[PDB]
Write a protein that binds this ligand. Structure first.
Ligand code: NAI
Ligand code: NAI
Ligand code: PRO
Ligand code: PRO
Lengths: 325, 323
């Protein structure tokens, strides 16, 4: 078996590659060449956490992988990231395990790239100002993937944690070579956005629909269970809704389940799944005045296409350590 | 996180340990302190194999583990085991991964132990002769666990491959210190058995119910999908049926699903789940003449308590590699 550490992975993969790869994974999913059973969620109520088991098999790409990822929103208080993951790659021909790789970095990369492909189809091409609510691990790759897809000029970041917003604005500004300024309310970041990035831990809405002007595109990736949401009901109803997967969002995302329980929206309010948009069967952004919202909770195909991408580059680069079991 | 190889694991855990631990896991499951959602099976039709994802959380034992196990019946043609597994242990307090360990040895140990617990409650205490149909990997731990709970004197082994039965008879007899004789039909092994072990890869019945005499207890652990079976409908109908879990067997075991399609039995023919037997809520063996059948497909909690037993012994014994 081969081992790939976070240091190993950061070396191998870039966001432009991951954007292309996640896009192909969804095209493979639309053509009936993907087996993605709904992920299994075990809630650890005793320790305020979740653990998610996300297996998938992409038969054309021959990517047979499972990711074990956990969400503990209070982990940052113990010097630990909220999201920790591991990815296992198996050989489709024998079922033998091929690799164990650190999944935390890949989770952030594949999540940003998933919103990157959706941003290509749903965001105004002339978008230059991006607003970020929640300056955590996901927000960094979220903004990075948005910058790979649009000619972003300036970014606004709001967080309840002043350290996270400052560290984000400083470090990401040199990172992406764009100006990033911390703002001091979620209202301001939402009102001035051409593209809005929401990557929060909050269990109650932070984005009010009354702030969103026309022509803005929203990427929302936060998830803390089916009871939690970061967008109020007005935001969802007001937008042209695209989901990463209907089966996943409708079963896991309080951002959608709660407004439908209220009766503000129904299952038909979902315009399309991302797989239909990538395939060209369903259309993305059609005019300047619509407000587009991409709701993402995570799909296992993004881990498999990224893990096999990273695994095959390690072989070609001689990266990683071999182990016996 | 810590890495544990088969060589690391093989020393650490014994069959007496795993039986005690698996029985405790089933009691924990009965008391509502286990989260064992039904496992996810992805069939790789393209390569004639299955891969199984088995997560579970035992909250009292604080064992949060997932096993990735695969079944490729044609692997023995490539010099590879039919069943290959990996087990990942996570920290319940942080969600952080604690260990990656080889699951092949643990799956054999926990599978034998699960039948070891069932045999203790369902088999006659005066059982002396054990019959084995299918002399593969699982059969060895199956007989070992039966030997840990009953005073077995002699074993009879039948396999469709005479090489496998002979190799089983030789190797297992030295390990367990009991006489083991090769027979040349499933009928003979079944007819003379006090306890019958069935652990085959067959997709069609190998044991006929007409062969089973009264007082026999059967452990059947084979699985090759819900369309495959190693027991004919008569063995199922004739027996008091105990399953490791109702949700798993009725969804995955052709040994049970097919006789229910025929109308020979219905859902009520399941006497009890193993968890109810361990808890004492349901009765085990009530008389000497009953024929008892334990149907096992595998349950994620048995992996979790065994993985955490081993992980916890590795730390105390300084075994494993950090990465
Ligand atoms: N493909 C997907 O959809 C995936 C979903 N997620 C979810 O994305 C979200 C972000 O994940 P991470 O960045 O890794 O965690 P993180 O803990 O490192 O960052 C979360 C940020 O949200 C901020 N925040 C929390 N509540 C806020 C509030 N009311 N108002 C303003 N800011 C607030 C926090 O201060 C923190 O900076 C999480 O909800 C996670 O469950 C995580 C990985 C990928
Ligand atoms: N109940 C549980 O928890 C578990 C279920 N299993 C299943 O147990 C069965 C055996 O597993 P392993 O021993 O690891 O595989 P194995 O390949 O090592 O052994 C299978 C044995 O069955 C024999 N056999 C095959 N067809 C036969 C037939 N018609 N008649 C007589 N003998 C036949 C084969 O010669 C072979 O020796 C498989 O179905 C496996 O999927 C595997 C792990 C645990
Ligand atoms: O799918 C994922 O990877 C993220 C992890 C936390 C919740 N969802
Ligand atoms: O429970 C298990 O581990 C075995 C693996 C193959 C089918 N059942």
């Amino acid at each position: 078996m081969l081992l790939l550490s976070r240091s190993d992975l950061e070396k191998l993969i870039s966001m432009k590659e991951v954007i292309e790869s996640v896009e192909r994974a969804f095209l493979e999913l639309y053509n009936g060449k993907a087996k993605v059973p709904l992920r299994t969620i075990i809630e650890v109520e005793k320790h305020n956490g979740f653990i998610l088991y996300m297996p998938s098999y992409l038969e054309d790409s021959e990517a047979l992988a499972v990711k074990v990822v956990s969400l503990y929103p209070e982990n940052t208080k113990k010097g630990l990231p909220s999201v920790l993951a591991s990815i296992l790659l198996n050989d489709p021909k024998t079922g033998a395990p091929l690799a164990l790789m650190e999944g935390t970095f890949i989770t952030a990369m594949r999540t940003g790239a998933a919103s990157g492909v959706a941003t290509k189809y749903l965001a105004r091409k002339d978008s230059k100002i991006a607003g970020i609510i929640g300056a955590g691990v996901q927000a960094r790759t979220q903004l990075w993937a948005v910058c790979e897809v649009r000619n972003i000029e300036k970014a606004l970041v709001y967080d309840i944690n002043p350290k996270n917003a400052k560290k984000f604005a400083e470090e990401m500004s040199k990172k992406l070579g764009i100006e990033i300024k911390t703002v001091e309310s979620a209202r301001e970041a939402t009102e001035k956005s051409d593209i809005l990035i929401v990557a929060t831990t909050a269990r109650e809405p932070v984005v009010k629909g009354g702030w969103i002007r026309e022509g803005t595109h929203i990427n929302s990736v936060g998830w803390v269970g089916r009871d939690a949401r970061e967008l109020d009901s007005e935001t969802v109803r007001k937008s042209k809704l695209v989901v990463d997967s209907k089966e996943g969002v409708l079963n896991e995302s309080g951002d959608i389940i709660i407004p439908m329980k209220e009766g503000v929206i129904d299952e038909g309010h979902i315009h399309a799944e991302l797989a239909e948009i990538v395939a060209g069967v369903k259309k993305g952004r059609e005019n300047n005045r619509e407000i587009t919202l991409f709701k993402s909770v995570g799909l296992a195909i993004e881990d498999a296409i990224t893990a096999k991408l990273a695994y095959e580059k390690a072989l070609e680069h001689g990266v990683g350590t071999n182990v016996e079991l």
